[PDB]
């Protein structure tokens, strides 16, 4: 019937002034564009079919052709930036926004999907979709007493499109649009569907990936406790975005970081810092590094939750990126911590893994480790116990690594190693 048509046949059908022939040709185009391997998007564009599909989007009298053209244009817009641009240049944004209010649920869903692709292209098309007024009808589709009444796929597509409206920086989404979307996003963040939860967490992670004012916009809605609960979830697709969001939040002020701590986040990090998925370990160690850069009371809460031994463990054995994040965490700890907190860090066994990491090739991690060692030595100076620490480093074999780094190509490593050896060895 409409299977395995040539683009020539599709064009002949769509060029006929018979709406039923046009519908069948558009369905053939949809089926061609829905094939697993290499859909002929470029051939369809070159045939000049995008304007015809956009015109069909407005055939209120023929809902099937609306649906077929919406599907075809969705799949064209799923391709390269040039193909999405081809869809946009045909005038598809306002037509899809108009279809958002269609009485046919499948057509409205297809329009949601298409606008999601368009906005997902980048910040320019995102903001253009916003300027055409998509947020109001999109959110109206979700203004129901109980989200569970909506079809699962429909709700998932709406959540994903909203997440794409929150995505990308340079520039970040308009502030008024973020404020308009956030309430519905919190409501979705309390939904029970794993995919909806994952995409809501991804949206929140986008919104928190910026200055402290954006983070404040998010945290003032009260989402941090729910984010921590989701941090404790079993599904990795949920934990990953939740963890990214929590990390973004703790990159902000001390008060926002304290909101993360007050919600019980630290209690989850024994598992996160031992998670078998390397990316979770890296992201959790980076989050810990930003928490240890906080106040001394926040460092103390890190201590009380027994997380210093887990940092020692990650420093001792882990993927090198995770070990680098752990070195950052240790240096921040030693920079902001009290003498008591620093000696506790040493008592947990940080020196040996920290010295073993000086064998790496990355210069910046070497500089970070040397700064942490300098801070620990200052702490030991205020206690007059520098010789015990020097003996601990020498027995470990770290003095050899430092006197070797004296000959490092980088100037900062050279000077820091020489300062350490001149002042304490």
């Amino acid at each position: 019937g409409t299977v395995n048509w040539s683009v020539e046949d599709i064009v002949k059908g769509i060029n006929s002034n018979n709406l039923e022939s046009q519908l069948q040709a558009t369905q053939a185009a949809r089926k061609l564009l829905s094939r697993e391997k290499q859909p002929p998007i470029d051939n369809i564009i070159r045939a000049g079919l995008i304007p015809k599909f956009v015109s069909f989007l407005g055939k209120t009298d023929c809902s099937p052709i609306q649906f077929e053209s919406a599907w075809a244009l969705t799949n064209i817009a799923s391709g390269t930036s040039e193909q999405t641009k081809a869809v946009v240049d045909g005038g598809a944004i306002p037509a899809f926004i108009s279809l958002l209010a269609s009485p046919h649920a499948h057509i409205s869903e297809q329009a949601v999907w298409a606008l999601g692709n368009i906005a997902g292209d980048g910040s320019a098309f995102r903001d253009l979709v916003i300027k055409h007024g998509a947020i109001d009808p999109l959110l109206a589709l979700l203004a129901v007493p109980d989200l569970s009444t909506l079809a699962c796929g429909y709700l998932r597509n709406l959540t994903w499109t909203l997440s794409n409206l929150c995505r990308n920086k340079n520039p970040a989404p308009p502030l008024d649009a973020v404020e308009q979307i956030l309430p519905t996003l919190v409501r979705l963040l309390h939904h029970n569907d794993p995919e909806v939860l994952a995409d809501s967490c991804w949206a929140i992670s986008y919104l928190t990936d910026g200055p402290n004012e954006r983070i404040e916009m998010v945290v003032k809605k009260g989402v941090v406790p729910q984010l921590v609960k989701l941090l404790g979830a079993t599904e990795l697709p949920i934990v990953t975005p939740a963890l990214r969001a929590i990390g973004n939040i703790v990159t902000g002020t001390d008060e926002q970081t304290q909101k993360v701590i007050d919600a019980g986040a630290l209690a989850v990090f024994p598992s996160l810092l031992t998670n078998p998925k390397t990316n979770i370990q890296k992201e959790a160690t980076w989050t810990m590094s930003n928490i240890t850069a906080g106040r001394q009371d926040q460092i103390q809460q890190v201590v009380n939750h027994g997380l210093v031994p887990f940092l020692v463990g990650v420093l001792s054995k882990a993927d090198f990126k995770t070990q680098k994040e752990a070195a950052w965490a240790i240096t921040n700890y030693t920079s902001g911590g009290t003498v008591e907190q620093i000696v506790y860090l040493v008592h947990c066994g940080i020196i040996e893994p920290l010295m073993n990491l000086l064998s790496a090739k990355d210069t910046k991690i070497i500089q970070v480790i040397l700064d942490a060692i300098s801070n620990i030595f200052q702490a030991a100076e205020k206690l007059g116990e520098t010789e015990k620490l020097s003996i601990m480093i020498e027995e470990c074999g770290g003095l050899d690594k430092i006197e070797a780094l004296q000959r490092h190509e980088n100037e900062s490593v050279y000077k820091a190693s020489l300062n350490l050896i001149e002042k304490y060895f």
Partner: peptide
């Protein structure tokens, strides 16, 4: 001790094809 923000995402376009 300064806070370190996340590294840039390398996935610059998020789109979905309907099969």
């Amino acid at each position: 001790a300064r806070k370190r923000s996340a590294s840039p995402t390398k996935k610059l376009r998020y789109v979905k094809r309907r099969f």
